[PDB]
Amino acid sequence: NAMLNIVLFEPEIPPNTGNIIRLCANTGCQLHLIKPLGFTWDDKRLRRAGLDYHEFADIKHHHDYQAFLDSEKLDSTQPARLFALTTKGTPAHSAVSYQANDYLLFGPETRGLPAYILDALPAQQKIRIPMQADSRSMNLSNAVSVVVYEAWRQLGYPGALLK
């Protein structure tokens, strides 16, 4: 079972998604992609970038946001254990108490998440990774990495090789 469900809404920049595929494979997360993507999906490019088949073969691809909600049995209005990562959020990523299988939703690199998705979530389900005043948002793949490793830490790193 998926440590976390990492959900990218209309991702734009190929290397970010490539980095996230690698991250999810290393940590036991299930990656979900919501179309339209800003790049064309291509098995051959993913392999050339160094990704192994089993890293990308089992990614879930969703036609649109409501189809993602329906597929994952998330209540469209008040979705269970869905958190949106946004600079517009309230709690820090480390202030949420994660559970296995939580859904973590990230926006596109240029636009961020649409207003109708954020306006429908309560403040406590919109997570802001801390940044200094005046900052440029995070790189998308860095944002995902930070939240994934924080959640995994809280969970006691289930599935990690021990040293």
**Residues of the binding site for S-adenosyl-L-methionine:** 85, 107, 129, 137
The structure tokens listed for 87 are: 């600079």
Closest CA to 61 of 86, 82, 84, 41: 41
CA angle 73, 149, 160 (to 5 degrees): 95
If binding is defined by CB under 8 A, does position 94 make contact with its own copies? yes
Taking the complex as a whole, the smallest distance from the CB of residue 145 to its own copies amounts, in Å, to 4
Cβ 40 to its own copies shortest distance, Å? 20
For 1, 114, 127, 162, the CA distances from 75, given in Å and listed in that order, are 21, 18, 19, 37
Instruction: Give the interface with ligand SAH as residue ranges (CB under 6 A).
Output: 85-87, 106-107, 109, 112-113, 127-129, 131, 137-138, 140, 143
The amino acid at 134: D
Interface contacts to its own copies, rule CB under 8 A: 15, 19, 22-23, 25-28, 50, 52, 55, 89-90, 92, 94, 128-133, 135-139, 141-146, 149-150, 152-153, 157, 159-161, 163
